[PDB]
């Protein structure tokens, strides 16, 4: 019943003391933190506490949208040699640093996921040519579904896939995705392997990655310019912003101290130094 | 009155009994006691096998040594108990398995000895690689060092042999072996054996995972990391030595999907 926006426990006025009770003495061998408050050690007056923990609630701590990835696509001229650039990105929070570390404060989580799409385009070649306002399809390809090989192949029919046709210039795109995990919680860290190396099998056949569950965990997004070739080249950058809503978490873990290296927990050399120089007897 | 103390503890599981006269109470991880799967959270349809007394008993892992040189030590559960009586037998015989533990670490000395050992319990204790070229490259055979377990190192030394990698964990002590400052290791359930005070660490651990029951062969639930917070010191000596012994007891263990035995390639 104690909500987030509740006033914190008050400070009780306590006077001088000379008794056989020892708030001050403990033993951190027990693993337990000694739970004291100012009054326990020094004389205090009465204080009606006003501050609340309101903002520090798990839900509020993740209430911000965050850039997960930057997908780049383009629409070149018809005569061109290179193909029209259409991107495919494996949906994961671990491509960027910020949001990841925040999510790493715990062992597991559940959250309905909100994605936002900020598209931004421009020309590239020195020319005064023209491009009419461009549209963009963002097709979510769940694991196993046919990944588009061309920018104009059958896959874009999306008879079952959930897509979003964004018209450039209008407000950023947004879609809601519930907790879609195969487990009873999303796993930030997975101490194990997908395969088991059997003895009646060759090492190769039984080998897999350390820390990985399913290579394809959530699927890929596919983004393409819908409008056809235009004599003047136009490149586009779609920025995805994720805001984890309705979030729950379990078992806290120490926050990442050294820079990330790969999708794993691994650390690169040359970054193994986080704390600076400070003399013990210097304030 | 009758003389009941926090230091004096007698734990009993099956046909094994652990006593102690210098304890510092006991730790129930996240306040939850280990338990059997409730119909509400059940997942596999078959009748689960609960070995009970057959597997729910203390198993002593070979004793390691502590010297001024020691950086650290680590194990994985259920991994560590992979070859402990029926628990292992049952473990290898089923596709799924969930178990909790009563971890008791033993390390005594004299009132003239000094130091501190932090036995940490980390659910999903992922450790870091040894290559500056290949992420997440530690091979299964090095990921699961059984009852002998592993250690922590004082320096990160990359593996350069790209002709045949060493594929092991290089878990830097101060980084708790996972890129985070050791000083924060207390967020995990823990006890610190500080020689002058106690002589043992008892950490009861419930089953913790993202799934109700999971493949034990493939995945380790908990992690037991022991690193000397205070280095070992004895008298005016240059080479002191005292042993550390780990006895872990699986609790409320249940296994589903009975099939032929898995003979893993451990070497």
């Amino acid at each position, epitope marked *: 019943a104690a909500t987030s926006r509740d006033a914190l426990p008050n400070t009780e006025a306590s006077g001088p003391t000379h008794s056989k009770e020892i708030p001050a003495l403990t033993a951190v061998e027990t693993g337990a933190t000694n739970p004291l408050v100012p009054s326990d050690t020094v004389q205090t007056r009465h204080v009606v506490q006003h501050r609340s923990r309101s903002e520090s609630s798990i839900e509020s701590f993740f209430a911000r949208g965050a850039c997960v990835t930057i997908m780049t696509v383009d629409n070149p001229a018809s005569t061109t040699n290179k*193909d029209k650039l259409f991107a495919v990105w494996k949906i994961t929070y671990k491509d960027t640093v910020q949001l990841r570390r925040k999510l790493e404060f715990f062992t597991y989580s559940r959250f309905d996921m909100e994605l936002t799409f900020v598209v931004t385009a421009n020309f590239t070649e020195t020319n005064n040519g023209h491009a009419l306002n461009q549209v963009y399809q963002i097709m979510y390809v769940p694991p196993g579904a046919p990944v588009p090989e061309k920018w104009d192949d059958y896959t874009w029919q999306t008879s079952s896939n959930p897509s979003i046709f964004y018209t450039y210039g209008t407000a950023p795109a947004r879609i809601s995705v519930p907790y879609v995990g195969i487990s009873n919680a999303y796993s930030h860290f997975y101490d194990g392997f997908s395969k088991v190396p059997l003895k009646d099998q060759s090492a190769a056949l039984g080998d897999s990655l350390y820390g990985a569950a399913s290579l394809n965990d959530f699927g890929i997004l596919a983004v393409r310019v819908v409008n056809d070739h235009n004599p003047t080249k136009v490149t586009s950058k779609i920025r995805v912003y994720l805001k984890p809503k309705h979030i729950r978490v379990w078992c806290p873990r120490p926050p990442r101290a050294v820079a990330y290296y790969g*999708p794993g927990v691994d650390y690169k050399d040359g970054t193994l130094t986080p704390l600076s120089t400070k003399d013990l007897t210097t304030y | 009155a009758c003389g009941y103390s926090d230091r004096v503890l007698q734990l009993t599981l099956g046909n094994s009994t652990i006593t102690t006269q210098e304890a510092a109470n006991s730790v129930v991880a996240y306040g939850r006691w280990p338990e059997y799967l409730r119909d509400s959270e059940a997942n596999p349809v078959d009748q689960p096998t609960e070995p009970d007394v057959a597997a729910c008993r203390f198993y002593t892992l070979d004793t390691v040594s502590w010297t001024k040189e020691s950086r650290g030590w680590w194990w994985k559960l259920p991994d560590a108990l992979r070859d402990m009586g029926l628990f292992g037998q049952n473990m290898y015989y089923h596709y799924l398995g969930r178990s909790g533990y009563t971890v008791h670490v033993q390390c005594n000395a004299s009132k003239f000895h000094q130091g501190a050992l932090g036995v940490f319990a980390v659910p999903e204790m992922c450790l870091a690689g040894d290559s500056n070229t290949t992420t997440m*490259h530690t091979s299964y055979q090095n990921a699961n060092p059984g009852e002998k377990g592993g250690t922590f190192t004082g320096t990160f030394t990359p593996d350069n042999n790209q002709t045949s990698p060493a594929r092991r964990f290089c878990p830097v002590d101060y980084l708790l072996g996972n890129g985070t400052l050791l000083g924060n290791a207390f967020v995990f359930p823990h006890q610190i054996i500080n020689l002058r005070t106690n002589n043992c660490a008892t950490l009861v651990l419930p089953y913790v995972n993202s799934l109700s029951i999971d493949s034990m062969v493939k995945h380790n639930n908990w992690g037991i990391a022991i690193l000397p917070l205070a280095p070992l010191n004895f008298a005016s000596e240059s080479s002191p030595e005292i042993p550390i012994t780990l006895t872990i007891a699986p609790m409320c263990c249940e296994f589903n999907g009975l099939r032929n035995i898995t003979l893993p390639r451990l070497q």
Partner: nanobody
Amino acid sequence: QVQLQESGGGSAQTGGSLRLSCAASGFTFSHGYMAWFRQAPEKEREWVACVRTSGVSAYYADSVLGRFTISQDNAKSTLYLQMNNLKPEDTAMYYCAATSISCSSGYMFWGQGTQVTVSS
């Protein structure tokens, strides 16, 4: 648009050697593996060999052991399959399956493949 395009041909005499290449693009998130697969004329698709992300740690198929060599050049973002001692069993199509992996089985990107023929 992770474009995987094989090359290397396939029309050698029995016993020779060929160099099977594969141009990779798009976003190959290094970490994982990169490999080779064969379908054969009339058999099931079979795994040939897999090499680690950037690491030169690899394995080979029992059938091809030592007679096939799979490397990489992540500077050139390519993978190579040198094949010495080609034989009548090696006559088949070869595919550069280099994406995700994590092991020697999972994929989200394949190529168009190329045929090899060891005649005699």
